[PDB]
Enzyme design. Sequence first.
Site, short mmCIF file in Angstrom:
data_model
loop_
_atom_site.label_atom_id
_atom_site.label_comp_id
_atom_site.label_asym_id
_atom_site.label_seq_id
_atom_site.Cartn_x
_atom_site.Cartn_y
_atom_site.Cartn_z
N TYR A 95 22.88 32.68 -41.35
CA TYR A 95 23.02 34.45 -41.22
C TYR A 95 23.30 35.09 -42.42
CZ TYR A 95 24.86 32.44 -36.71
OH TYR A 95 25.31 31.59 -35.55
N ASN A 118 22.32 38.72 -28.30
CA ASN A 118 21.94 38.57 -28.02
C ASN A 118 20.93 38.29 -26.50
OD1 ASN A 118 18.16 37.58 -27.38
ND2 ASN A 118 18.92 35.06 -28.66
N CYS A 126 18.41 32.93 -31.22
CA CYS A 126 19.45 32.95 -31.47
C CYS A 126 19.92 31.11 -32.28
CB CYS A 126 20.59 33.52 -31.38
SG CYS A 126 21.12 32.71 -29.25
N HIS A 127 19.70 30.50 -31.33
CA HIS A 127 20.60 28.79 -31.49
C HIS A 127 19.94 28.63 -33.29
CE1 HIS A 127 16.10 28.29 -29.38
NE2 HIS A 127 16.40 26.74 -31.16
N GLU A 153 14.15 20.90 -30.50
CA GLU A 153 13.50 20.34 -31.89
C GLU A 153 13.13 19.75 -32.72
OE1 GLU A 153 14.08 24.67 -32.90
OE2 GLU A 153 13.72 25.21 -30.66
#
Length: 165
Positions: A95, A118, A126-127, A153
């Site tokens: 952040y 979001n 946002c993840h 991912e």
Amino acid sequence: MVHYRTIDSPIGPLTLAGHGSVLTNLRMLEQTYEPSKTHWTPDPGAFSGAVDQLNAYFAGELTEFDVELDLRGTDFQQRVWKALLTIPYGETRSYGEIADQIGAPGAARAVGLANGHNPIAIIVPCHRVIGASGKLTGYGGGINRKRALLELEKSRAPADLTLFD
């Protein structure tokens, strides 16, 4: 008006909404309160491009989306969501890094609040933003969804196996 379509996914039913071919919303809506949806038209064939990419994404065959978006929210939110869109598949940011990138050093907590609003999940990623302590956030099963996306991912195999020969 605005139409919508819900599809299966490993993280639960994803609702896609927007006008025509433009996405305005993408959310795992079940067991949440979402008053706008009452005034949406079901369209079982809407956003067929988006749905294909999402299916491809979950199957590990996609890492970049080509989907037209219309992001609605405050100026600060637009700045945050725009910055989320620069985070590549398989990477993360803090952040605090996002706050620096948008020109507001020290605004880590404001980024976190804006991140939680979001409208378009996954595609606006946002993840991929996590605090220094490593703790995932998000009520309503949100933590578990983020974690799923992250593990997906991170499991990315090399694209070209011929680079090994």
